Design a protein. Structure first.
Length: 216
């Protein structure tokens, strides 16, 4: 990756979390990824090639999205194998989804040790947020980075991918030069709400009592 003219850098991204989190909606935000999606019958996985353009050139994250297998049970070893990075998604309106994040993390780490993982709390668009910055403590212990996301509004779509890219490449200076074509926001995430949520994360990030915050 250090030199130019090298063949395309692709990473296998495993997207896991409880059914109903909004994993499918999240992946589908990237239009090109949707258009180029491939369904692997044996696995029962939809692989979406998400191309992100960075300062160093294109980085492709082959996002493996489940076919809803998570609803009836765990995911097979084949799904997890050779994962370079992962995003574990929970729903901020459902406490249970957050509670099951340790289980997903454990299964993921068993197959792939020391891979960069971002935990994302989706559906921050919904006003009654149940899992707040105050209670998100899982990341500290596991050295995972946390991002508030809203699939519906394309809020912070770039951030998990960017952090993963930086860690994988090993360059903290990596920036996404252009934003990929994204499906138009279903709902608009209110700027005031976004600001408040980010502020909450930061306040406790500095080890204030809030948990995501204790995490940082």
């Amino acid at each position: 990756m250090a030199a130019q003219g090298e063949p395309q850098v692709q990473f296998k991204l495993v997207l896991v979390g409880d059914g109903g989190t909004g994993k499918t909606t999240f992946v589908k935000r990237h239009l090109t990824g949707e258009f180029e999606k491939k369904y692997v019958a044996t696995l029962g996985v939809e692989v979406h090639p998400l191309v992100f353009h960075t300062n160093r050139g294109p980085i492709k994250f082959n996002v493996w999205d489940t076919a809803g297998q998570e609803k009836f049970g765990g995911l097979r070893d084949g799904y997890y194998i050779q994962a370079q990075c992962a995003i574990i998604m929970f729903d901020v309106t459902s406490r249970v989804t957050y509670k099951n994040v340790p289980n997903w993390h454990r299964d993921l780490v068993r197959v792939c040790e020391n891979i960069p993982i971002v935990l994302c709390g989706n559906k921050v668009d919904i006003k009654d947020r149940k899992v707040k910055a105050k209670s998100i403590v899982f990341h500290r212990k596991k050295n995972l980075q946390y991002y508030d996301i809203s699939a519906k509004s394309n809020y912070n779509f770039e951030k998990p991918f960017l952090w993963l890219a930086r860690k994988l490449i090993g360059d903290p200076n990596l920036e996404f030069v252009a934003m990929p074509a994204l499906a138009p926001p279903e709902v608009v995430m209110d700027p005031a709400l976004a600001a408040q949520y980010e502020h909450d994360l930061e306040v406790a990030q500095t080890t204030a009592l809030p948990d995501e915050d204790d995490d940082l």
